[PDB]
Amino acid sequence: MFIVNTNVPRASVPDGFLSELTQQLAQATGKPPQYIAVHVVPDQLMAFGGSSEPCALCSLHSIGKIGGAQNRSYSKLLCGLLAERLRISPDRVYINYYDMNAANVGWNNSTFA
Amino acid sequence: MFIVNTNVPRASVPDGFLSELTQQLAQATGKPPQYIAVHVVPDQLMAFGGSSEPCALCSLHSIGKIGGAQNRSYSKLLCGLLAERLRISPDRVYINYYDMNAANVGWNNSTFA
Amino acid sequence: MFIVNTNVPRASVPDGFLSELTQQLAQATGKPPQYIAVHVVPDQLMAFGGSSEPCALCSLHSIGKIGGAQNRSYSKLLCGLLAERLRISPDRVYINYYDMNAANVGWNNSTFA
């Protein structure tokens, strides 16, 4: 599950963006794309280092596939995509990574445990 | 605290939905309804498995009352409600469960510790 | 990173609020304001304890600077601000505090590790 909150306006989010995220996250995490969920929230009231220049606050939740090297690799990918598609500088992006226990993720009337 | 983000439109969220979630969560968690917070965010730009068919990304935070069996039960309850009231398929819902330490939840100028 | 979700309408958020939050959080956390991110989301569909008087659901993520006494101090400051500026009663504010590992925070194409 990847969520991006940004002050970039909705009209600046290119068509195809959610599919591009889905695809690249599936490749990066090694997870099947059927399990990948993405959520983009434009037009937000936000600031980064006191400034309202384009920025993004993001989260990536996964059951495993979270760790030092893997998170570095995710950040390079995701900042790269935010720069190329939303014109957000990578140094105005935070991404919180969460390694979820399977018992703590609900789906399809039960959990993954 | 229960949060639902969904691509279902605002008009499709029935009047009374926040009160129903409040009541059912109070019953499920055993907590008084005065402590239950609910937040529904419709009209979102999101996808699940690459698809923009109705879906939901949710979170349930609680000080205790989180665990393997309890979270299975919550997921049956909450996917049931999202299916009945918002017409979302349970297999397009993720719920992240968070067992919060009392010291890490702020309220009324202090924390719950 | 501080996020506030509230039912208070956008027109009730005073000019300067994101700067005030940035400033006061820099002071409270001891971190330079260049590293502080803030995000205010008004006009939400939310209830707290069964009712829809002004309320807020918030999160504060930090690499360290999270703990029992510190979090009590943050709650005093942030509930104070939300009361003074948004007219939200402190007993209708929840703030979830997250102590993030540096390896689990992405920024500038890498992590903080």
UniProtKB/Swiss-Prot annotation, chains A, B, C:
PROSITE patterns per record: MIF (PS01158)
Q: Which gene encodes it?
A: MIF
The residues that hold substrate are 31, 63, 96
Give the location in the cell.
Secreted; Cytoplasm
Give the family per the record.
Belongs to the MIF family.
Induction (UniProt) = Up-regulated in concanavalin-A-treated lymphocytes. Up-regulated in macrophages upon exposure to M.tuberculosis antigens.
Q: What organism is the protein native to?
A: Homo sapiens (Human)
Provide the primary localization.
Answer: secreted
Does the UniProt entry include the keyword Endoplasmic reticulum? Answer: no
Note the PANTHER family from the entry: D-DOPACHROME DECARBOXYLASE, MACROPHAGE MIGRATION INHIBITORY FACTOR
* Misc. comment: Serum levels of MIF are elevated in patients with severe sepsis or septic shock. High levels of MIF are correlated with low survival. Drugs that inhibit tautomerase activity protect against death due to sepsis.
| A GO cellular-component term linked to this record | vesicle
State its Enzyme Commission number(s). 5.3.2.1, 5.3.3.12
Ribonucleoprotein as UniProt keyword: no
Q: Which domain of life is it from?
A: Eukaryota
Q: Which residues carry this modification: N6-acetyllysine?
A: 76
Q: Which reaction does it catalyse?
A: 3-phenylpyruvate = enol-phenylpyruvate; L-dopachrome = 5,6-dihydroxyindole-2-carboxylate
- According to UniProt, the name of this protein is Macrophage migration inhibitory factor
List UniProt keywords, sorted A-Z: Acetylation, Cytokine, Cytoplasm, Immunity, Inflammatory response, Innate immunity, Isomerase, Secreted
